[PDB]
Every structure is written in structure tokens, then in C-alpha cells.
């Protein structure tokens, strides 16, 4: 990539070029920590001198630099980033069936199903969500809540070069703001749901919604919008719509949801046929995720029946309704989830409620340095929908843990039996003991998380699911 190529292709973003038509560019980077030699560095709104010695050929910037150094000055750094990136990796999206999945809820599950449902129906590609990155064959499991434009596009160019014709990507409501995914074009576009409350919230609801529709700008004029029925009319653009839902007039229409410890069983009316679907993952919410997929997928002449038979193998996402099926070995069934909203909490308990023929006991705490006030109402939820509530320490990052517990304690209905134990290890041990023949013990807050973060920097090992299994191995022992 010449600078001549950049300027040429992307001229209108660029305000002023003070740089040789020459400076071949070898890579792109956003953090100083990460600069290679020859890369172009993009300075987001002192460091300039630093990043140049580290080996930077030139630097993008939003205001006048005034330094001896080769620099493209742009109208909007962050946008520019996306766009450049798309070039330097050479638009990896044209060659690969790309999927973007946004919504308030169900991003990860829906994306992961797509992923699973393609590999499983034979095929090779790549997924990239919050919870699971699989870069080609590799499941490079690691640090992916802080990806930018370059990291995503990077990872789509491994996919294509390594010969996969599809990339399944979760489009965070966050990420549409960054503009992380602005240099992309998607072949399909799933929009799962939208909350009218004050979950996932920026402005009013219209600002909240509009920003989530933007995805469909970023959509190939070839490809399709896969929409929730309840958002039918909101679709302000002019492209292919496929609806799903329960209304009798949605393109794909899902029916008799039947959640049980074997999983969600539902019945989906495709607009050419009709079929049983069984996912193994538990939760009624899992039917609008499944439906959204069998739609998007089958909107490319994949035989439905066969797609539907895919979902059978899908056993949820690690840390999301993870049943410790290995607990029946005692006398109990145990659920690990990650719920850190009043909301996910409620959904969970209702589902364990439906599915559980017995008492439901809930171990949870709250994370340091999220909302301080959404805390006592998290307890409020659990105080209602659960027979016994065991309150334990979570990841009190910065926060002093006993100054979290106070905040949580207010929402507990003091009339019902609640129990407070500040050591997660003992909370869990206890709940297993006080719970009976065939009760359900649910542990929330953490999920697949691998350490408990007490100190900003000082953290001990604690895998929620595993400690459970540990205590069970120990009880059975004697």
C-alpha cells in the first residue's frame, strides 16, 4: 500500500496530506504499545514523537500536528481508521459470507448458533463475539471486549486467506459507536430484539433504536435484513426484510416453546414449510435466537430440515445456563450463569422456575464499578423469584466489598429467608448443603470467568463451574 493508494481510494475523508506519495505502508495500529516498524499510527483524541521512534512510517491526526513527521490529517480519526483498515487488508468481506448480529439481547447466542450451524452442516469459517473468538481453526480464546476496527478486519483476513467463506460477528451496541465495524459490508444482518426500558441505554429510545438500525446501512445491496417482527415498521431503509416472531404475519413464525432440562423445544413455521426444532440449550429466549438463525441461514437455500437438525447438537454457550449435569450425582441440579443485570437475573430464575420441579436457591453478588444503584434492585428481583437467597462476594474490583454488600442488602425482602456469606467458596458450599432432594441451586454473577478480581491488581483463581464440581467430588468421596 502506497500512500498514493490511500489518498486515491479514500480521498474525501482526508483533509490534508503532508506526506510522500511514496511511503509504502506495512501495517496499521491504534495503540502505541502495538506499533510495528512501517505501520501507520492513528492518533485518537507528545505521543507522536514516541510512536515514531518505535518504528512508525506516518501518523493520522484530527488537528494540526506541527512536527517534522509524515502525517495525514483527517476529518474523523476513528472513522478513517475503519475505512483504511478495510483497504490495507483488502476488503476481506467480499469473498466471505459475513454476518452481523445486533440487538439488545441474544447477540452472542444467535451468532454462536449460526457458527455452530454452519460448521455442523459442513463448512469452515470463523466467529468473533464477546465470549468466544474462533479465528479460523484456532479458538484463540482471549482478550476480546476491547477490539477496534483493525483487530476485527485483521481477523477477517485470516479467515479469507485461510479459506473460509463466512465470518460470524457480534455487533455490540457499543461497537456501532466506536464505528468499529464501519469499513465492513455484511451479507446478512440480524437484529434480534430491542429493550424499551433503561437496559443498554444511551439517549431516549429513538436515539437508542436509530443507532441500532445503522447496521443495515453497512449491509451489501446484495444481502438481507433479518428482523424481529415487533420492529417491522421501524425499518427506515429499503432492502430485503425477513421477519421472525410469533405474530401470524411474520416471515418465520415460532410456536410451542417447551423448555425443560433437555432444552428448548419449539415449532417454527418457515414460509415454505414447517418443522420441529429442538435446541439443547435451555431458555424460551433461545427460540427467537434459533428462529433468527434458521431464517438468516435458510435465506440462502440451505435445506431447513437439515439446518433444524443442526440445532440439536448445540448445547448453549459456556457460562450461559451451563447445567452442572454432573451434580445429579449428589441429589441436586445446579446452574451456572453470568447474570449481572436485574434483567438477566429475572429471565434466568423464571426459566429455572419453569424447568424446576422443586425449590430454587440463588447464590450471587455484584461486580465492583458497574451501576451502584441497579444493585439493590438486583436483590429485589432474586428476593421475589427465589426460595432462598445466598449473598456472596463477587469481583469487588476497586470497590471495598462490604460497601457493595450494603448496597445489595437493601433490595432483599428481609421477611423471606436470606443468608449472607462473604466468601464465595463457602456461599457455594453452603447452598449445596441446605438444598434438598432435587432442589435447584443457581450461581450467578460470574459465568466462565477464570479469576476472581479482588484487587485492581491482585487476583486468585476461581472458576465458578469448577469449584462446584470440586465440592461435589469431595461430598461423594464420603
Ligand X SMILES: Nc1ncnc2c1ncn2[C@@H]1O[C@H](COP(=O)(O)OP(=O)(O)O)[C@@H](O)[C@H]1O
What 3-state DSSP class applies to 266? strand
Please report the DSSP string for 273-322 in residue order: --EEEE-SS--TTHHHHHHHHHHHHHTTT--HHHHHTTTTT---BTTBSE
Does 159 participate in binding ligand X (rule CB under 6 A)? no
Q: Which lies closer to Mg ion via its Cβ, residue 98 or residue 108? A: 108
Residues 126-165, mask of contacts with Mg ion (x by CB under 5 A): ----x-----------------------------------
Cell numbers placing 30: 491504534
Q: Which lies closer to Mg ion via its Cβ, residue 131 or residue 155? A: 131
Q: Which lies closer to Mg ion via its Cβ, residue 130 or residue 230? A: 130
- CA gap 184, 128 in Å, rounded: 14
Contacts for 122 with CB less than 8 Å, ≥ 6 apart:
none
Task: Answer yes or no: are the C-beta atoms of 169 and 181 closer than 8 Å.
Answer: yes
Q: Which lies closer to ligand X via its Cβ, residue 80 or residue 191? A: 191
Q: What values do phi and psi take at 353, rounded to 5?
A: -65, -60
What 3-state DSSP class applies to 150? helix
Does 26 participate in binding Mg ion (rule CB under 5 A)? no
Q: Which lies closer to Mg ion via its Cβ, residue 410 or residue 450? A: 450
Does 192 participate in binding ligand X (rule CB under 6 A)? yes
First to last CA, the chain: 67
Task: Answer yes or no: are the C-beta atoms of 317 and 108 closer than 8 Å.
Answer: yes
Does 4 participate in binding Mg ion (rule CB under 5 A)? no
Residue 106 site contact among ligand X, Mg ion, none (CB < 5 to 8 Å, cut-off depends on kind)? ligand X
Whole-number minimum distance, CB 255 to ligand X, in Å? 16
Does 307 participate in binding ligand X (rule CB under 6 A)? no
Does 246 participate in binding Mg ion (rule CB under 5 A)? no
Residue 145, annotated as binding a ligand: yes
Does 239 participate in binding Mg ion (rule CB under 5 A)? no
Does 344 participate in binding ligand X (rule CB under 6 A)? yes
Does 120 participate in binding Mg ion (rule CB under 5 A)? no
Does 71 participate in binding ligand X (rule CB under 6 A)? no
* Residues 434-473 contacting ligand X, CB under 6 A: none
Residue 155 site contact among Mg ion, ligand X, none (CB < 5 to 8 Å, cut-off depends on kind)? none
Q: Which lies closer to Mg ion via its Cβ, residue 4 or residue 130? A: 130
Task: Answer yes or no: are the C-beta atoms of 272 and 229 closer than 8 Å.
Answer: no
Residues 107-146, mask of contacts with ligand X (x by CB under 6 A): xxx--------------------x----------------
Contacts for 206 with CB less than 8 Å, ≥ 6 apart:
none
Cell numbers placing 131: 465470549
Nearest residue to Mg ion, by Cβ distance, number only: 130
CB-count exposure of residue 302 (10 Å: 0-12, 13-18, 19+): middle
Cell 480519526 found at: 77
**Which spans of this chain sit near ligand X (rule: CB under 6 A)?**
105-109, 130, 192-193, 283, 285, 288-289, 344, 347
Amino acid at each position: 500500500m502506497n500512500i498514493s493508494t490511500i489518498v486515491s481510494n479514500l480521498k474525501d475523508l482526508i483533509l490534508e496530506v503532508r506526506a510522500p506519495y511514496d511511503l509504502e505502508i506495512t501495517g496499521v495500529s491504534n495503540h502505541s504499545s502495538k506499533v510495528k516498524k512501517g505501520d501507520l499510527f492513528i492518533c485518537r483524541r507528545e505521543i507522536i514523537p514516541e510512536v515514531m521512534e518505535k518504528g512508525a512510517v506516518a501518523v493520522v491526526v484530527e488537528r494540526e500536528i506541527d512536527l517534522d513527521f509524515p502525517y495525514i490529517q483527517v476529518f474523523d480519526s476513528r472513522y478513517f481508521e475503519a475505512k483504511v483498515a478495510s483497504l490495507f487488508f483488502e476488503d476481506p468481506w467480499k469473498d466471505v459470507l459475513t454476518f452481523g448480529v445486533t440487538g439488545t439481547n441474544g447477540k452472542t447466542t444467535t451468532t454462536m448458533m449460526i457458527y455452530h450451524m454452519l460448521t455442523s452442516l459442513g463448512e469452515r469459517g470463523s466467529v468473533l463475539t464477546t465470549a468466544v473468538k474462533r479465528i479460523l481453526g484456532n479458538s484463540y480464546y482471549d482478550d476480546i471486549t476491547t477490539p477496534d476496527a483493525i483487530t476485527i478486519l485483521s481477523a477477517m483476513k485470516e479467515n479469507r486467506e485461510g479459506g473460509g467463506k463466512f465470518f460470524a460477528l457480534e455487533v455490540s451496541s457499543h461497537a456501532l459507536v466506536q464505528q468499529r465495524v464501519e469499513g465492513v459490508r455484511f451479507d446478512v444482518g440480524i437484529f434480534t430484539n430491542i429493550s424499551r426500558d433503561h437496559l443498554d441505554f444511551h439517549g431516549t429510545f429513538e436515539n437508542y433504536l436509530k443507532a441500532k438500525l445503522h447496521l443495515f446501512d453497512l449491509l451489501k445491496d446484495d444481502g438481507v435484513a433479518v428482523l424481529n417482527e415487533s420492529l417491522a415498521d421501524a425499518f427506515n431503509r429499503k432492502s430485503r426484510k425477513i421477519t421472525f416472531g410469533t405474530s401470524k404475519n411474520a416471515d418465520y413464525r415460532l410456536g410451542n416453546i417447551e423448555v425443560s432440562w433437555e432444552g428448548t423445544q419449539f415449532v417454527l413455521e418457515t414460509p415454505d414449510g414447517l418443522l420441529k426444532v429442538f435446541t439443547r440449550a435451555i431458555g424460551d429466549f433461545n427460540a427467537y435466537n434459533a428462529a433468527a438463525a434458521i431464517a438468516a441461514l435458510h435465506q440462502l437455500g440451505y435445506d431447513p430440515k437439515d439446518l433444524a437438525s443442526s440445532l440439536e447438537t448445540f448445547t448453549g454457550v459456556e457460562g450461559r445456563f451451563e447445567v452442572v449435569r454432573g451434580a445429579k450425582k449428589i441429589g441436586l441440579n445446579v446452574v451456572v450463569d453470568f447474570a449481572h443485570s436485574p434483567d438477566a437475573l429475572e429471565k434466568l430464575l423464571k426459566n429455572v422456575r419453569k424447568i424446576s420441579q422443586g425449590r430454587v436457591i440463588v447464590v450471587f453478588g455484584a461486580g465492583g464499578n458497574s451501576d451502584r444503584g441497579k444493585r439493590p434492585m438486583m436483590s429485589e428481583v432474586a428476593s421475589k423469584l427465589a426460595d432462598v437467597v445466598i449473598l456472596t462476594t463477587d469481583d469487588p474490583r476497586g470497590e471495598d466489598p462490604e460497601q457493595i454488600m450494603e448496597d445489595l442488602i437493601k433490595g432483599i425482602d428481609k421477611r423471606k429467608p436470606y443468608l449472607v456469606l462473604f466468601d464465595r467458596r463457602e456461599a457455594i458450599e453452603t447452598a449445596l448443603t441446605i438444598a434438598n432432594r432435587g432442589d435447584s441451586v443457581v450461581i450467578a454473577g460470574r459465568g466462565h470467568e477464570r479469576y476472581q478480581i479482588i484487587d485492581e491488581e491482585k487476583k486468585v483463581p476461581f472458576q465458578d463451574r469448577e469449584v462446584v464440581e470440586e465440592i461435589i467430588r469431595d461430598k461423594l468421596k464420603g
